């Protein structure tokens, strides 16, 4: 087997309508988890008033991906952003997706509502067809295949909490056996039906404070939360950035438990995180950060940190970092996985952990917290090296846990070629897209690898993008050009002067 | 390109004729109705 | 181990494939109880949830157990739990 590799990632996560949004609200220690009434009036029925949200989910560019305005006003808002966030997430690696069309690329999609079908399927007098075909959960992942043109699976999966990291390791496992080059492995929870809400209260899953107060003395529950995510697995050979390398993926469930199907279990999540450290043949002295549930619960936490406490804390001497990426944004039911992936590959490539949220002091029945074995990361913290673990566990018992290998690849010595001015060419659907790539080029005119990435990514057909532009980058002068590409092929000719 | 704005379910789309409970019961408020009974009937 | 109230708010898929599928266990002439503690996997096809439709239609009235009983990915995660599977427990709906 070859190595799997992760290429490109995007997300419209809570107040963040890209990655850097995120990230800046992550490091800055904004709460991403605001209290108006977008969705609903808040406080309808008891509900919690906190809950994250999108920006905006009434925005799609139907023309580039080739649906008329009829089918996209019946379209899942969850399908919608998912198309752009995965269209995204293969640029982000420096792949133009023409490369990806005709192979056995595969599409598993973690998916847990479709409130939007029941929306549009209420009134039988006046209800279209369309509506299958673009809410049917199954489309999450055939849309997408459809559109890309990919001959691999298709797959809608479904497991609670746990659904985008289990489509993380079907992936993983579907490369890893040589059954596809390359997948894309995505997650998407939008919140618009209240009464889902109002279940979950019901069963007692939900903090009425409305904040996920991760390994805290006060974890009353967990703040529902919405958000799109989308990453590019790849294997060595296609990809040309690489965030991290997928040492090792696994799965299980709990099995039988005499509190009840949603009582959480630890021994089973220890035997999991055990089963892959070893079979990946990685010391447990070797982590340094693992990505907890962290969904604050009062029973669950102390299951899960006490099972990673006796899975890896058994004989290392430093501490391990521990941090939830549920404290800044709340929890994206099927998207949980995913998000705290994201965070976890931007702090890596930042070079700095994003702080928890909403930690004061430590849970009286944590031992490892106040031991000291365990460390919240409740402050920008310098990574030092190591590897990385991700975990997460639903509701019904499907555990998943995944372990990275960073990538500490330096920037290249200089080299006398770098001096020669070098050309930045883009293409976008509208003249500001063109320029924000000609600024982004112009900002970091030193960095080859990136122009070359940027490059890569610009030989879109003009009726797919009828705008383009080119900036010569370090050169005595010229800035940006752009202008609109007339339609049709041009003839190319030579003239040879005497 | 995001000039278009397309439909998004509301929160009316989905479930959620005035009804009125007449109850006897000495626990209820109702209960008053036992004492208008005409013709040996309540 | 469904108590009656639990009973009510569950999806009849669920409760028939719980029987059906202590038969196909039995019918393979293997005792169910030696598969417990193992690492059998279970996946379902499902592609309705038409139950949770009609169990949270009522905000007033609804029970929290519907979530339990009736969610899509508890379809395969209450197999495992009453079988004792510790194998994966997914739920496909890739359509037809």
Same mark, same amino acid.
């Given at each position: 087997?070859?190595?799997?590799?992760?290429?490109?990632?995007?997300?419209?996560?809570?107040?963040?309508?890209?990655?850097?949004?995120?990230?800046?609200?992550?490091?800055?220690?904004?709460?991403?988890?605001?209290?108006?009434?977008?969705?609903?009036?808040?406080?309808?029925?008891?509900?919690?008033?906190?809950?994250?949200?999108?920006?905006?989910?009434?925005?799609?560019?139907?023309?580039?991906?080739?649906?008329?305005?009829?089918?996209?006003?019946?379209?899942?808002?969850?399908?919608?952003?998912?198309?752009?966030?995965?269209?995204?997430?293969?640029?982000?690696?420096?792949?133009?997706?023409?490369?990806?069309?005709?192979?056995?690329?595969?599409?598993?999609?973690?998916?847990?509502?479709?409130?939007?079908?029941?929306?549009?399927?209420?009134?039988?007098?006046?209800?279209?067809?369309?509506?299958?075909?673009?809410?049917?959960?199954?489309?999450?992942?055939?849309?997408?295949?459809?559109?890309?043109?990919?001959?691999?699976?298709?797959?809608?999966?479904?497991?609670?909490?746990?659904?985008?990291?289990?489509?993380?390791?079907?992936?993983?496992?579907?490369?890893?056996?040589?059954?596809?080059?390359?997948?894309?492995?995505?997650?998407?929870?939008?919140?618009?039906?209240?009464?889902?809400?109002?279940?979950?209260?019901?069963?007692?899953?939900?903090?009425?404070?409305?904040?996920?107060?991760?390994?805290?003395?006060?974890?009353?529950?967990?703040?529902?939360?919405?958000?799109?995510?989308?990453?590019?697995?790849?294997?060595?050979?296609?990809?040309?950035?690489?965030?991290?390398?997928?040492?090792?993926?696994?799965?299980?469930?709990?099995?039988?438990?005499?509190?009840?199907?949603?009582?959480?279990?630890?021994?089973?999540?220890?035997?999991?995180?055990?089963?892959?450290?070893?079979?990946?043949?990685?010391?447990?002295?070797?982590?340094?950060?693992?990505?907890?549930?962290?969904?604050?619960?009062?029973?669950?936490?102390?299951?899960?940190?006490?099972?990673?406490?006796?899975?890896?804390?058994?004989?290392?001497?430093?501490?391990?970092?521990?941090?939830?990426?549920?404290?800044?944004?709340?929890?994206?039911?099927?998207?949980?996985?995913?998000?705290?992936?994201?965070?976890?590959?931007?702090?890596?490539?930042?070079?700095?952990?994003?702080?928890?949220?909403?930690?004061?002091?430590?849970?009286?029945?944590?031992?490892?917290?106040?031991?000291?074995?365990?460390?919240?990361?409740?402050?920008?913290?310098?990574?030092?090296?190591?590897?990385?673990?991700?975990?997460?566990?639903?509701?019904?018992?499907?555990?998943?846990?995944?372990?990275?290998?960073?990538?500490?690849?330096?920037?290249?010595?200089?080299?006398?070629?770098?001096?020669?001015?070098?050309?930045?060419?883009?293409?976008?659907?509208?003249?500001?897209?063109?320029?924000?790539?000609?600024?982004?080029?112009?900002?970091?005119?030193?960095?080859?690898?990136?122009?070359?990435?940027?490059?890569?990514?610009?030989?879109?057909?003009?009726?797919?993008?009828?705008?383009?532009?080119?900036?010569?980058?370090?050169?005595?002068?010229?800035?940006?050009?752009?202008?609109?590409?007339?339609?049709?092929?041009?003839?190319?000719?030579?003239?040879?002067?005497? | 390109?995001?000039?278009? +704005?397309? $439909?998004? @379910?509301? +929160?009316? $789309?989905? @479930?959620? +004729?005035?009804?009125?409970?007449?109850?006897?019961?000495?626990?209820?408020?109702?209960?008053?109705?036992?004492?208008?009974?005409?013709?040996?009937?309540?």
């Amino acid at each position: 087997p070859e190595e799997v590799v992760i290429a490109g990632m995007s997300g419209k996560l809570p107040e963040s309508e890209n990655l850097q949004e995120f990230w800046d609200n992550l490091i800055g220690g904004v709460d991403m988890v605001t209290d108006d009434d977008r969705r609903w009036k808040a406080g309808l029925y008891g509900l919690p008033r906190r809950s994250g949200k999108l920006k905006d989910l009434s925005r799609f560019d139907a023309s580039f991906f080739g649906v008329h305005p009829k089918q996209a006003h019946t379209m899942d808002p969850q399908l919608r952003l998912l198309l752009e966030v995965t269209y995204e997430a293969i640029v982000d690696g420096g792949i133009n997706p023409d490369s990806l069309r005709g192979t056995h690329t595969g599409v598993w999609v973690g998916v847990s509502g479709s409130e939007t079908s029941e929306a549009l399927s209420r009134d039988p007098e006046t209800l279209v067809g369309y509506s299958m075909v673009g809410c049917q959960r199954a489309m999450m992942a055939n849309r997408l295949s459809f559109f890309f043109d990919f001959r691999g699976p298709s797959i809608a999966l479904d497991t609670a909490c746990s659904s985008s990291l289990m489509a993380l390791q079907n992936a993983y496992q579907a490369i890893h056996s040589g059954q596809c080059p390359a997948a894309i492995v995505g997650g998407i929870n939008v919140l618009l039906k209240p009464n889902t809400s109002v279940q979950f209260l019901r069963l007692g899953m939900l903090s009425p404070e409305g904040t996920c107060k991760a390994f805290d003395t006060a974890g009353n529950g967990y703040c529902r939360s919405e958000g799109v995510v989308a990453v590019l697995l790849t294997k060595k050979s296609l990809a040309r950035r690489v965030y991290a390398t997928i040492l090792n993926a696994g799965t299980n469930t709990d099995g039988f438990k005499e509190q009840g199907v949603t009582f959480p279990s630890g021994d089973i999540q220890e035997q999991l995180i055990r089963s892959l450290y070893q079979s990946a043949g990685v010391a447990p002295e070797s982590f340094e950060y693992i990505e907890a549930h962290g969904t604050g619960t009062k029973v669950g936490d102390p299951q899960e940190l006490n099972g990673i406490t006796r899975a890896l804390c058994a004989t290392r001497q430093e501490p391990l970092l521990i941090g939830s990426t549920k404290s800044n944004m709340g929890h994206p039911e099927p998207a949980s996985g995913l998000a705290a992936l994201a965070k976890v590959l931007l702090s890596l490539e930042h070079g700095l952990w994003a702080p928890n949220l909403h930690f004061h002091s430590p849970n009286p029945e944590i031992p490892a917290l106040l031991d000291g074995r365990l460390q919240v990361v409740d402050q920008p913290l310098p990574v030092r090296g190591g590897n990385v673990g991700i975990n997460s566990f639903g509701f019904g018992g499907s555990n998943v846990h995944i372990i990275l290998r960073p990538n500490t690849q330096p920037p290249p010595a200089p080299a006398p070629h770098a001096t020669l001015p070098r050309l930045l060419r883009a293409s976008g659907r509208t003249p500001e897209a063109v320029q924000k790539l000609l600024e982004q080029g112009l900002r970091h005119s030193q960095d080859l690898a990136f122009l070359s990435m940027l490059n890569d990514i610009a030989a879109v057909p003009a009726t797919a993008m009828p705008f383009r532009g080119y900036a010569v980058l370090g050169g005595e002068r010229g800035g940006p050009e752009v202008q609109q590409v007339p339609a049709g092929e041009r003839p190319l000719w030579f003239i040879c002067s005497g | 390109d995001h000039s278009l +704005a397309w $439909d998004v @379910p509301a +929160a009316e $789309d989905f @479930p959620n +004729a005035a009804i009125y409970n007449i109850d006897t019961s000495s626990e209820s408020p109702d209960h008053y109705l036992v004492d208008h009974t005409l013709d040996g009937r309540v």
